[PDB]
């Protein structure tokens with residue numbers, strides 16, 4: 449009765465939440481999605497027919513990042529409305545709190561793919577308001593279940609701050625965050641701030657760290673509080689840490705997986 453399982457590419461994936469695909473699509477045992485254009489179909493036969501006809505082998509929009517077989521496409525919701533609506537309905541399967549599926553024109557979408565000889569395979573994405581009155585640099589961020597906890601979420605969160613740096617602005621993801629999203633941001637912020645605290649020593653203020661990382665002062669403070677690296681003096685949070693305590697944190701299992709890194713040399717983008 450609601451969609452509860454999808455087939456996309458070589459994966460079958462169970463749903464986590466309701467998504468408002470048309471009612472008729474929910475009635476089927478599975479929903480079949482083209483992994484390139486994201487069209488959703490009701491039958492294995494209409495899916496197989498589509499696979500032989502469809503000419504897409506990557507997302508639409510512009511490839512703004514490519515390094516080896518990792519790529520990011522920027523897709524404006526006004527230029528590619530149907531693709532973006534399809535992506536939003538797919539994402540809502542895994543996001544409890546996303547509420548926008550059809551009115552995609554105010555958004556830009558950054559689609560992460562991993563490329564082989566067959567084409568560019570969607571891993572996840574994040575959406576971002578073209579104009580955010582609140583300074584949100586991510587609206588929703590979703591990594592499909594088979595790629596979760598494998599470094600792709602870390603890449604996309606880093607990528608989102610790389611755009612913010614290019615815009616000379618700080619940014620924070622729109623709340624509420626998902627459960628995975630919270631853990632992932634907390635770990636990313638800790639990593640970035642600890643690595644900057646290692647490389648300086650260093651007369652870095654919180655404002656300094658915000659300008660260097662595009663992480664907001666508030667998210668830096670809440671992170672530094674969770675690491676017990678801040679003292680408070682007459683109304684001001686101030687950094688307080690030894691080089692050694694910084695290394696103790698970084699030696700921990702959390703920060704030991706080799707990251708897929710965002711190479712600024714491979715990013716092609718300027719503020720619109």
Ligand SMILES: O=C(NNS(=O)(=O)c1ccccc1)c1cccc(-c2ccccc2)c1F
Nearest residue numbers: 591596597598599600601602626628632635
């Ligand atoms: O994969 C993830 N994080 N794990 S990760 O290895 O990339 C990572 C992230 C940050 C720090 C360290 C490791 C990840 C990161 C952000 C969002 C989601 C997500 C949220 C709701 C529904 C579906 C997915 C994630 F799954």
Ligand SMILES: [Zn+2]
Nearest residue numbers: 482485486502
């Ligand atoms: Zn297709």
